[PDB]
Amino acid sequence: NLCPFGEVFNATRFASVYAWNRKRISNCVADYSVLYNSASFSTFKCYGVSPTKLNDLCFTNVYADSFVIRGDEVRQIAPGQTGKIADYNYKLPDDFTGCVIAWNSNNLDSKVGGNYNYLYRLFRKSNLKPFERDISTEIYQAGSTPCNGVEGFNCYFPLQSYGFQPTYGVGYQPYRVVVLSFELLHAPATVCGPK
């Protein structure tokens, strides 16, 4: 069984970061060389692993998380980061073992006049735990008066749109991100490089 990485990296559509997609990879043979020999990535940064050694390693599970953010937010997809994305949308743990891979997707995800489909969460009562996902769309209570789910004074819709346009500067352009988590439990390791 070959691990289905192509389904993740080459997906036609990507998730909004607040509703990031997760694909569990298990019990398969992974050829990571299609990733580490590729010249298509703007970021390929690993934690706890050397990417060129990946075809020699075995893990219990691999998770592939994917979403779109803007280019100047990719730096928040790292252990120890703060900010709207790290705090309210997608959080990595301090002891992360995995790789963060991103590429400029201006040609796919931007639209003349704006692509409003990609959203992020701007308000939240507390920070996400690592790998927590919040897809709720409850009106956020910024004041002492309950909102009752009605937007208005001190009561905010918690998501905003990126509105990507192709003429935006590169830090504001959309980037597709895939986070690979390499999980070794005290258990059999069934995601392996080729033998």
């Epitope: 704006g114 409003y116 959203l119 769309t137 409850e138 009106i139 789910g149 009605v150 937007e151 208005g152 004074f153 009561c155 905010y156 819709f157 998501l159 905003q160 749109s161 990126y162 509105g163």
Partner: nanobody, 120 residues
Framework: QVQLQESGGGLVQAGGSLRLSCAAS????????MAWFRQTPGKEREFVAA????????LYADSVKGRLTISRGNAKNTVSLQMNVLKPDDTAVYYC?????????????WGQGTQVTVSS
Amino acid sequence: QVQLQESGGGLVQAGGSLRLSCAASGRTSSVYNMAWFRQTPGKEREFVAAITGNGGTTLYADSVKGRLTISRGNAKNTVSLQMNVLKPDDTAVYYCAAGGWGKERNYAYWGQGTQVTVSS
């Protein structure tokens, strides 16, 4: 899936009054702030007006104050925009937006827009 649908556009004569409408569809337990933006070909889309969930607070672009009125419609997440004394340069695609406040184009939900063409 929350979607917005505008109606009421078309070809109108200068001086005339026109009402546009927007309705949200999809399962939701929220009542949104709703807004109207407009876009002329070759130009950036621009804020026109917004109204809060309960209809009690409105926000207008300075250029349209006194000529345009925004109001909530009959269902929870519906909004109306009446434009009076239409001018040729009111010609635009008019978009409904929902979820947010203010004049920037970062509201959560957006319609595909309705064309208004003013003749003289």
